[PDB]
Amino acid sequence: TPMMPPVGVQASILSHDTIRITWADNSLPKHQKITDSRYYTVRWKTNIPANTKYKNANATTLSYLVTGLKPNTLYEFSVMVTKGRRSSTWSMTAHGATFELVPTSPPKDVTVVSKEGKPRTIIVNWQPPSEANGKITGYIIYYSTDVNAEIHDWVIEPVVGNRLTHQIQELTLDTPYYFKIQARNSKGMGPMSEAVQFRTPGTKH
C-alpha cells in the first residue's frame, strides 16, 4: 500500500563541505513527532553532469546533515519514507551549493617558452589547481634571477581572471629566471607552485 512522499524539502548551506536537508511529513501531526518504525532515505548528486550516481543515507529524524561535498558545488536533494514494508516515491528536488574555500592546491603544469623571434620575451603557461575550491579570480606570477631571494624581492606579475597563459617581456638574455605561480578566488590566495627554472637564450652574431 503506497505512502505519501516528504514535502517542504529545504537545503541549508553550512560550510564548503556540508549542507543540512530538512523536510516535513504530512502523515504526521503538526508537531511532527515520529512515534512509528518509519525511516527516511536522502539521496544527492551533483546537478552537472546529468548522469552522475546518487549517493544516499538513512535518518530517523526530519533533517539530515550531508557531508564530504566538494567546495563551490551545486547538488540536487530528494527524500523518501519507508514505514515497514510500505515506502514512497522521491520527494520534490531541493538544491544547494557549498561555499567556496581558498585554493588548497597550487597551479599545475607550469611551463615557460621563449617568444618566437623575441628572445627577451617569454610565454608562461599553467593549469588551474586540482583543489581550486571556487571560481578562480586570477593568478600571481613571481619571478626572480635569484632563487634564494625572499618573496618580497621577487617581481610580481598579476594575471586577472581565469587566464592560463601570460607573456613577460624586457627580460635579460642568457640568464636563468625562476617562476612561482599562485591562484586566487573570492575567499583568498592558495599555495604556490614549486619554482620552475628557465634560461633565456643567448645571441649568436
Take residue 141 and report the three cell numbers written for it: 606570477
Smallest distance, ligand NAG to C-beta of residue 28, A: 20
* 195 is an interface residue for ligand NAG by CB under 6 A: no
Contacts of 180 (CB under 8 A, 6+ apart): 141, 142, 143, 154, 192, 193, 194, 195
CB of 142 to ligand NAG, least distance (A): 47
Select the residue whose beta carbon is closest to ligand NAG and give its number. Answer: 58
Structure-block grid coordinates of residue 122: 617569454
Does residue 57 touch ligand NAG according to CB under 6 A? yes
Cell of 148: 634564494
CB 9 within 8 A of CB 94: yes
- Determine which residue in the list 5, 40, 41, 64 makes contact with ligand NAG, applying CB under 6 A: 41
- Cell numbers for 23: 523536510
- Cβ-based neighbour number of residue 184 at 10 Å: 20
Q: Which residues contact 48 (CB under 8 A, 6 or more apart)?
A: 74
Q: Which stretch binds ligand NAG (CB under 6 A): 56-64, 93-101, 122-130, 148-156?
A: 56-64
Q: Select 39 or 198, whichever has its Cβ closest to ligand NAG.
A: 39
CA-closest candidate to residue 76, choices 60, 88, 65, 92: 92
Is 61 near ligand NAG (CB under 6 A)? no
Q: Does 165 bind ligand NAG (CB under 6 A)?
A: no
| Smallest distance, ligand NAG to C-beta of residue 82, A | 8
193 binds ligand NAG (CB under 6 A): no
Instruction: Kindly tell me which residue out of 26, 56, 93, 130 binds ligand NAG, with binding defined by CB under 6 A.
Output: 56
Contact between 52 and ligand NAG per CB under 6 A: no
Shortest spacing between CB 80 and ligand NAG, in angstroms: 10
Q: Which three cell numbers stand for residue 109?
A: 603544469
Binding residues with ligand NAG: total (CB under 6 A) = 4
Q: Are 142 and 155 in contact (CB under 8 A)?
A: yes
Q: Kindly list the residues in this chain that would bind ligand NAG in the complex (CB under 6 A).
A: 41, 56-58
